[PDB]
């Protein structure tokens, strides 16, 4: 019955939050917890995807800790994204449910990468790895490979404490005090501008609906207390702005409507926006700083909106980013230049970073498998320091690779001239990356099937999928000699292994190295190479 409650979203979201918070409850028995978890699941199923946005935001801060409480939310997200992947992935969206906003996709990306990094750093826990055996795969399938996030930076964030950096303990420059005074006067100028827009005059008499305290008096007579209490936040903000290693340099030495109207028409450079949203995040960190100074006295009822400035809603984000952009624009106009990485859209894409991390982990795989051959050859150690890396690789990356490149195969094979997928085609660089990953995995498993053991079937299946994904035509015509040489070396090695196997069967050998090559061929090589030939011919 909760399916169509788009008109009581406030109540539905409040109920969802209450049930989740109760799930995270001490003095709570296992049966009670299971009941709460089942209720939350069932509600999430029938509730529309747009409705869950806030819960997804909260989970983005909860789950990455990967504590005991992270089990149920992971399953919740798995099922939600499995059923609503059309909502996020497809541009048209899911029928009758619309499409994703963009902020939802940002949250999804953050959740993906937080879980990925946390699991990589954490030690093997068969329970946790099994709960993420349903894995980040639903998240990735829901996320478009071409999704480019408006904001691309480093969180540098960690119960939850928003802490700015403040130089108040140190003296404050007198030139800076002059700046604060100019800024406060020009803020009063925008304040009279705001009264001119609201069309209500200053009222020296008190009146309830204007609620204009008689203190309303032109700057010629304002009492100090109001002025300096308006000023102190300005002092704090400018001090913090400079404290965050941002150099302020007034270009030239100096000797009624606000002359710089805030004009949204002016396009702002991408760099300059990024600083604007960061300084707005600093304003929101001061906001959460005073809210926390207040709360710590209360000790409970954490104000719900206290969350990352990027995660929270744009409209609330709007005021702070507007103030930041205004202050910046004022600085540049006056000449008070405030100064001190946009990877193009292709680099900003999700698949790009995913493949980058996969290639990095392939390099790590080369490293610790080589160490494994060294140790097994002589001085065997049962410690296996890279145990965590081996487990992460085999358990998480291989199924994730399989699912991702089984779902998004068309995006990599599609070309602008010829498009298989409903929407989007991979960049030549992403095609190069997938080709390099395939060749690297083949080299890694070359003559090491036994060393990989039970993960070898997973390796072979991932290789099949990657082969079906490759666009060899594009990669070979327009691709780096490194990628082309890797693929050629794959072919040469396959040949050589075949000739050695074939002569062994010729019984020039006894028919160990020959047996190990034979099993490698039969298990991995002929299947993968046959698949690649079939895909090429198709």
């Amino acid at each position: 019955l909760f399916a169509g409650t788009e008109h009581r979203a406030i109540m539905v979201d409040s109920m969802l939050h209450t049930v989740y918070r109760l799930s995270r409850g001490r003095s709570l028995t296992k049966a009670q917890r299971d009941v709460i978890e089942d209720c939350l699941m069932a509600l999430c199923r029938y509730i529309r995807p747009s409705m869950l946005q806030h819960l997804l935001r909260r989970l983005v801060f909860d789950v990455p800790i990967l504590n005991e409480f992270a089990k149920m939310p992971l399953k919740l997200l798995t099922n939600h994204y499995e059923r609503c992947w059309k909502y996020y992935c497809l541009p048209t969206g899911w029928a009758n449910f619309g499409v994703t906003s963009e902020e939802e996709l940002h949250l999804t990306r953050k959740l993906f990468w937080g879980i990925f990094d946390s699991l990589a750093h954490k030690k093997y826990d068969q329970e946790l790895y099994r709960m993420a055996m349903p894995c980040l795969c639903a998240i990735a399938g829901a996320l478009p490979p071409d999704y480019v996030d408006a904001s691309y930076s480093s969180k540098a964030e960690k119960n939850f404490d928003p802490r700015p950096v403040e130089t108040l303990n140190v003296i404050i420059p007198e030139k800076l005090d002059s700046f604060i005074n100019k800024f406060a006067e020009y803020t009063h100028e925008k304040w009279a501008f705001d009264k001119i827009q609201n069309n209500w005059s200053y009222g020296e008499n008190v009146d309830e609906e204007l609620k204009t305290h008689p203190m309303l008096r032109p700057y010629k007579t304002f009492s100090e207390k109001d002025k300096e209490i308006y000023r102190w936040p300005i002092k704090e903000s400018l001090k913090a702005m400079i404290a965050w290693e941002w150099t302020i340099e007034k270009a030239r030495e100096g000797e009624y409507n606000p002359q710089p109207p805030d004009l949204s028409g002016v396009t702002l450079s991408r760099e300059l926006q990024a600083m604007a949203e960061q300084l707005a995040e600093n304003y929101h960190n001061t906001w959460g700083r005073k809210k926390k100074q207040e709360l710590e006295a209360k000790g409970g009822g954490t104000h719900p909106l206290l969350v990352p400035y990027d995660t929270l809603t744009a409209k609330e984000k709007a005021r702070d980013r507007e103030k930041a952009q205004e202050l910046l624009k004022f600085l540049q106009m006056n000449g008070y230049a405030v100064t001190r990485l946009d990877t193009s859209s292709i680099e900003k894409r999700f698949a790009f970073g995913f493949l980058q991390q996969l290639l990095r982990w392939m390099d790590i795989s080369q490293e610790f498998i080589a160490h494994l051959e060294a140790v097994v050859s002589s001085g065997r150690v049962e410690k296996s320091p890279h145990e965590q890396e081996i487990k992460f690789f085999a358990k998480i990356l291989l199924p994730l690779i399989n699912q991702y490149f089984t779902n998004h195969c068309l995006y990599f094979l599609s070309t602008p001239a010829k498009v298989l997928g409903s929407g989007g085609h991979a960049s030549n660089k992403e095609k190069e990356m997938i080709t390099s990953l395939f060749c690297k995995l083949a080299a890694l498993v070359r003559h090491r099937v036994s060393l990989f053991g039970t993960d070898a079937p997973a390796v072979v299946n991932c290789l099949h999928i990657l082969a079906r994904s490759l666009d060899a035509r594009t990669v070979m015509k327009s691709g780096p000699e490194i990628v082309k040489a890797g693929l050629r070396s794959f072919f040469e090695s396959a040949s050589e292994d075949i000739e050695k196997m074939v002569e062994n069967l010729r019984l020039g050998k006894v028919s160990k190295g020959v047996g190990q090559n034979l099993t490698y061929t039969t298990v991995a090589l002929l299947p993968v190479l046959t698949t690649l030939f079939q895909h090429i011919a198709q």
């Binding site: 001119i196 827009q197 609201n198 069309n199």
Partner: protein, 48 residues
Amino acid sequence: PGQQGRISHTDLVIGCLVDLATGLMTFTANGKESNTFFQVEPNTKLFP
């Protein structure tokens, strides 16, 4: 001209008048005569 506070609590009552014998059409804003006027030929049909 009130672009400032463009949203208006008031309601705008536009009146339309036609003389079916002279073919003359005129308009009122809030009881104030507008400058716009139209002249149409006889036997013309017009729908509000």
